[PDB]
Amino acid sequence: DDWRCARSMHEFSLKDIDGHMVNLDKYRGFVVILTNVASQCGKTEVNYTQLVDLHARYAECGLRILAVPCNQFGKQEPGSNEEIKEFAAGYNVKFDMFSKACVNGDDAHPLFKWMKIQPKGKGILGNAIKWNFTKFLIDKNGCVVKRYGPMEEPLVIEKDLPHYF
DSSP: OOGGGOOSGGGOEEEBTTSOEEEGGGGTTSEEEEEEEOSSSTTHHHHHHHHHHHHHHHGGGTEEEEEEEOOOSTTOOOSOHHHHHHHHHHTTOOSEEBOOOOOSSTTSOHHHHHHHTSTTTOOTTSSSOOSSOOEEEEOTTSOEEEEEOTTSOTHHHHTTSGGGO
8 A cells, every 4th residue: 555656546445425435446437527625615616516517517428526525624624424415415416425534644545645746736836735626637547637726616627628538
């Protein structure tokens, strides 16, 4: 278990919102938007609305969205996994929700550690995830191809999807 040597997201496993260990090679052959989410961020409703919209219009094209709740940014995701799942159901979320985890620090999930050190997943002024709703566009092979900041709404990613379908 050395994430620094992994060469694809498919090498990692992640607990879904229902406590079941989802093992991420299932998304091989699919385009993946990976994002850390939160319930009480100012950009929560705008991100959830457009993630559901992008899913409804591009799921047939192979787009899969993976939402990982995180409480490391202003403690804006304090609810339990059961509460988070309910909250996501309020937005008619039909993409994949996962268990609340950490994206920064020593206790960060190995997937997010590997994602931040990718060439296209690197960040300016440091590689750490700055705030809620950072997005990582991931191709069919599990390699990070683009990283989007917390201020960029999900529809900004739409223009980049057709190149990887």
